[PDB]
Amino acid sequence: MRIVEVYSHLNGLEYIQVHLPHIWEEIQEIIVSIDAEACRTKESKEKTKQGQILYSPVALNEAFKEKLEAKGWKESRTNYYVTADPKLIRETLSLEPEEQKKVIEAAGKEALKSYNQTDFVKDRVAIEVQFGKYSFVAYDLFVKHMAFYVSDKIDVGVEILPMKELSKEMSSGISYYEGELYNVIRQGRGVPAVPLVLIGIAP
Amino acid sequence: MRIVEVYSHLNGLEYIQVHLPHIWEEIQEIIVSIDAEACRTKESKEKTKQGQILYSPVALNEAFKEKLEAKGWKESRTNYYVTADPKLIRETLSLEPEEQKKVIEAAGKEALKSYNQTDFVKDRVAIEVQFGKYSFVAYDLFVKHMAFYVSDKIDVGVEILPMKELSKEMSSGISYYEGELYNVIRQGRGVPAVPLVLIGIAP
DNA sequence: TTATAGATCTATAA
DNA sequence: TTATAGATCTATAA
């Protein structure tokens, strides 16, 4: 595939270039190596795209996983408990999972187990190949990368999205670089307050 | 239905109380009037909830629409064009739609027509009944309410979500108040920088 | 024809 | 059994 567009939020790319120049190579190489055409297997079933052959997010994901894991990118998961009272949540943010549930219940409140996953993380960098309903991009950007960033676990979040010419050939509901780029640019240029690298591949 | 939980971000509620006290009444009344049990019509088809009767987001939405429109809440839509180059986007943020496309193409760039909808807006208040893929809540919060807020069109965003006891009876993928509340609380208490009122109904 | 939104199924892991 | 994620269809409007 080919890196058609690349945007650097709050110097997210320049950070990689200066401290992990090899990672930048790695990421680019990995992208260029995937044969998107080999991933064109999904037969749309929507009434509007009847009998059409689109690129498969499932295939494209398998392609990225295999390649990325092979390079050392491992998954990271954060478990936590949430409750209805905001002040209780604030008092449990620094504690450990088991410990949070404890302080919550120790107040007659209910403790709900949740978590956040990210299949690719390395040297404090988080990669998100995002081919799902477009709302996940804002979720990835304002919730996840930001979560890791403030938690001092990541130093820059990377979000890979398909350009409009690629999403134009995947099932409905999927986001496209151009648009998401807007969602970030639209609101000044310090929001979200997390270094990022939006990459918009698209062969 | 019943307002089980209510969170006020950056004094979003106190703003309504002091300038549109009647709106607060209105919103509460509207919520209390809807018969959720009458909206229990969707027969799940998932392999895990086989032959179970859940509450319908479709019904619950129709209930909210009818009631809210009846009270004067109208829809608002913002059209705009996006392009791949970030600097071009920055130069077109203040212009009018037709005008944006013009400046974009007048540089050999492609202009992609997009937009943002919000079914309920009144007296500079935006309501979002959100019963869709959980990622839409972060999208509603960090992208839409924020968009209106910075654009000086809204003064406080309102987000209505179902508590865990309600989402526990709707199809998979739907968010629940408790959790989303966390996503906001998790990152300090000035992020996002837009006054909000998260309401977690749940009968 | 198409864009954003909303509706719902399934995949994996704990 | 269940939670978060990811996969995809459809509804409405311009």
Side-chain angles (χ1 to χ4, degrees), chain A residues 48 77 115 117 133-134 164 168 172-173 176:
Chain A
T48 81
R77 174 154 162 170
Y115 71 86
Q117 184 93 36
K133 245 296 194 201
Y134 73 92
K164 177 65 164 175
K168 188 186 182 296
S172 180
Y176 59 85

Side-chain angles (χ1 to χ4, degrees), chain B residues 48 77 133-134 164 168 172-173 176:
Chain B
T48 82
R77 175 154 162 169
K133 235 306 192 191
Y134 76 91
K164 177 64 164 176
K168 189 185 181 297
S172 180
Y176 58 85

Side-chain angles (χ1 to χ4, degrees), chain A residues 24-46 48-73 75-78:
Chain A
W24 190 214
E25 255 73 295
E26 185 160 283
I27 293 175
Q28 282 165 283
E29 294 172 44
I30 298 177
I31 301 177
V32 80
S33 81
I34 289 178
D35 182 302
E37 189 57 41
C39 298
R40 197 159 193 161
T41 69
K42 172 75 178 189
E43 293 179 52
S44 188
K45 297 187 176 179
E46 322 180 17
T48 81
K49 292 184 169 57
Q50 212 62 56
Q52 205 188 317
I53 298 302
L54 315 177
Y55 292 78
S56 172
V58 172
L60 290 167
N61 268 132
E62 265 184 289
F64 274 97
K65 195 182 190 67
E66 180 189 298
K67 309 274 185 168
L68 277 165
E69 282 171 355
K71 283 289 180 176
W73 298 83
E75 70 201 306
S76 178
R77 174 154 162 170
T78 342

Side-chain angles (χ1 to χ4, degrees), chain A residues 89-90 92-97 99-112 114-160:
Chain A
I89 301 178
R90 320 189 69 70
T92 64
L93 295 166
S94 60
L95 308 181
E96 298 301 308
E99 203 70 282
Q100 309 178 316
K101 173 179 177 182
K102 181 180 176 180
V103 181
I104 304 174
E105 273 165 345
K109 266 45 189 299
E110 191 190 3
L112 300 179
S114 183
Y115 71 86
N116 286 112
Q117 184 93 36
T118 288
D119 298 331
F120 316 107
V121 175
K122 181 205 297 187
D123 287 306
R124 301 165 70 63
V125 179
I127 292 174
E128 293 267 358
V129 189
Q130 191 46 277
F131 294 105
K133 245 296 194 201
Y134 73 92
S135 41
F136 271 87
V137 177
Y139 180 71
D140 290 345
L141 295 193
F142 300 84
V143 167
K144 304 175 67 182
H145 290 294
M146 181 60 72
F148 284 153
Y149 187 61
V150 314
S151 294
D152 195 316
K153 290 178 174 181
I154 193 187
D155 271 353
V156 44
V158 177
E159 189 81 24
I160 295 172

Side-chain angles (χ1 to χ4, degrees), chain B residues 1-46 48-73 75-90 92-97 99-112 114-203:
Chain B
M1 294 184 97
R2 62 200 169 85
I3 298 81
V4 188
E5 279 308 314
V6 62
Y7 171 62
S8 174
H9 190 65
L10 292 171
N11 312 120
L13 180 67
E14 11 290 289
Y15 169 89
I16 297 181
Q17 286 171 168
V18 174
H19 302 90
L20 315 173
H22 63 276
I23 292 297
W24 189 214
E25 255 74 294
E26 185 159 283
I27 293 175
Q28 282 164 284
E29 294 173 45
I30 297 178
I31 302 177
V32 80
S33 81
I34 290 178
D35 181 301
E37 189 57 41
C39 296
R40 198 158 193 162
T41 69
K42 173 74 178 188
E43 292 179 52
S44 187
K45 297 187 176 178
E46 321 180 17
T48 82
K49 292 185 169 57
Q50 212 62 57
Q52 205 188 316
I53 298 302
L54 315 177
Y55 293 77
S56 171
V58 171
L60 290 167
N61 269 133
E62 265 184 289
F64 274 97
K65 195 182 189 67
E66 181 189 297
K67 309 273 186 169
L68 278 164
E69 283 171 354
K71 282 290 179 177
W73 297 83
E75 69 201 307
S76 179
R77 175 154 162 169
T78 341
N79 305 91
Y80 53 79
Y81 288 78
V82 303
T83 188
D85 182 333
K87 289 191 173 305
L88 218 76
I89 301 178
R90 320 189 70 70
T92 64
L93 295 166
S94 61
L95 308 180
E96 298 301 307
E99 204 69 283
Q100 307 179 318
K101 173 180 177 182
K102 182 181 175 180
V103 181
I104 304 174
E105 273 165 346
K109 266 46 189 298
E110 191 190 3
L112 300 179
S114 182
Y115 71 86
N116 286 114
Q117 184 93 36
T118 289
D119 298 332
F120 316 108
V121 175
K122 181 205 297 188
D123 286 306
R124 301 164 71 63
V125 179
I127 293 175
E128 292 268 359
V129 190
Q130 190 47 276
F131 294 104
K133 235 306 192 191
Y134 76 91
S135 40
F136 270 87
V137 176
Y139 180 71
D140 290 345
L141 295 193
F142 301 83
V143 168
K144 305 176 68 181
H145 289 295
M146 180 62 70
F148 284 152
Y149 187 60
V150 313
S151 294
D152 196 315
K153 289 180 173 179
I154 194 188
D155 271 354
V156 44
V158 177
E159 190 81 24
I160 296 174
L161 309 165
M163 297 288 291
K164 177 64 164 176
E165 54 170 295
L166 174 52
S167 66
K168 189 185 181 297
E169 300 189 299
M170 313 186 91
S171 295
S172 180
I174 294 180
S175 71
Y176 58 85
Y177 179 89
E178 290 94 313
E180 293 316 306
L181 201 212
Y182 190 81
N183 288 155
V184 176
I185 293 300
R186 159 153 54 168
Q187 53 200 317
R189 65 170 189 155
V191 187
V194 64
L196 299 184
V197 180
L198 307 184
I199 303 178
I201 75 180

